[PDB]
From a paper:
[name] (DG), a ubiquitous membrane receptor belonging to the glycoprotein complex associated to dystrophin, plays a crucial role in the stability of the plasma membrane, especially in skeletal muscle tissues where it is highly expressed. A single gene, [name], encodes for a protein precursor, which is proteolytically cleaved in two subunits, alpha-[name] (α-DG), located at the extracellular side of the plasma membrane where it binds several extracellular matrix proteins, and beta-[name] (β-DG), which is a transmembrane protein that interacts with dystrophin in the cytoplasm. The molecular structure of the N-terminal region of α-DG (α-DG-Nt) was later determined at high resolution by X-ray crystallography, revealing the presence of two domains, an immunoglobulin-like (Ig-like) domain and a domain similar to the small subunit ribosomal protein S6 of T. termophilus (S6 domain), connected by a flexible loop. Noteworthy, it has been shown that α-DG-Nt is necessary for recruiting LARGE and some pathological conditions that are caused by missense mutations in the [name] map within the α-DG-Nt.
The crystal structures of [name] and [name] have been determined to a resolution of 1.70 Å and 1.80 Å, respectively. Similarly to what observed for [name], residues 50–58 and 305–315, as well as residues 163–179 ([name]) or 164–179 ([name]), were missing in the [name] and [name] final models. That said, both [name] and [name] structures show the typical overall folding of α-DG-Nt. According to the refined crystallographic model, the pathological mutation Val72→Ile has no effect on the overall conformation of α-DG-Nt, but in this case also the local effects on the structure around the mutated residue are quite limited. On the contrary, the single mutant [name] shows a decrease both in Dmax (from 90 ± 3Å for WT to 80 ± 2Å for [name]) and in the Rg value (from 25.20 ± 0.04Å for the WT to 24.20 ± 0.04Å for [name]), pointing to a more compact shape as compared to the WT protein. In detail for [name] the profile is mainly unimodal characterized by a broader single peak: even if its maximum is slightly shifted to more compact models with Rg about 21–25 Å (60.4% of the total population), there is an increased fraction of extended models with intermediate Rg around 25–30 Å.
Author numbering: 59 to 162, 179 to 303
The structure:
């Protein structure tokens, strides 16, 4: 008598890490083969990665991933002739939303103080796991958890923010790629005198230790107050 497993729908935010556990032990009895894909395709959406050993589906969506993604979790039996005999399939969806509003909140009308690191990188050339690994490797410096950092592409080729009230240089002398912005929240309506200690960002950025850990050149960093939502 076959068992039916429903998986709940999820949500993701452009430029924020996405991570969910998939209940494979419920779906695959009797040593069956699990496949996780976009529904009706063999591959996942470009922003997702499936880790079969931890049972984790994870990703980092870009602007072009906005919208609903249906995900099929299937179990197949391997036949004596090597064929995969499908047994069951469970489909859920993930809706990618456009904006995290710079919030992992601040009062309304209260600007959010954001620290941004500008990287010589092109996120559209990076796999989902590479995007997550880059966020992981920033944790030593930000002291913010992976899921509370934001990672998005540079737009209109702007490698600077003229509203920033603190900033400094990285190790890069040239910028070869389009650029990526890796940012996090410091607080609400801060100024130079209430910003926390940032020597653990600014010194490794300038000396090259941050780029050596992240795997990408650092163009610079800045701190600026961003309009709410």
């Amino acid at each position: 008598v076959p068992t039916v497993v429903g998986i709940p729908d999820g949500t993701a935010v452009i430029g924020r890490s996405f991570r969910v556990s998939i209940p494979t032990d419920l779906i695959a009895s009797s040593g069956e083969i699990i496949k996780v894909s976009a529904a009706g395709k063999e591959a996942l959406p470009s922003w997702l990665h499936w880790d079969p050993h931890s049972h984790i589906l994870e990703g980092l969506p870009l602007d072009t991933d906005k919208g609903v993604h249906y995900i099929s979790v299937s179990a197949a039996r391997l036949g004596a002739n090597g064929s995969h005999v499908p047994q069951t399939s469970s489909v859920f969806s993930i809706e990618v939303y456009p904006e995290d509003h710079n919030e992992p909140a601040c009062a309304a009308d209260e600007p959010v103080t954001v620290l941004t690191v500008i990287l010589d990188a092109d996120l559209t050339k990076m796999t989902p796991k590479q995007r997550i690994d880059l966020l992981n490797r920033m944790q030593s410096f930000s002291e913010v958890e992976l899921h509370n950092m934001k990672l998005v592409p540079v737009v209109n080729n702007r490698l600077f923010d003229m509203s920033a009230f603190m900033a400094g240089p990285g190790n890069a002398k040239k910028v070869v790629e389009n650029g990526a912005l890796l940012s996090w929240k410091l607080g609400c309506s801060l100024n130079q005198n209430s910003v926390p200690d940032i020597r653990g960002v600014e010194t490794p950025a300038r000396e090259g230790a941050m780029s050596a850990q992240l795997g990408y050149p650092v163009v610079g960093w800045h701190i600026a107050n961003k309009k709410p939502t």
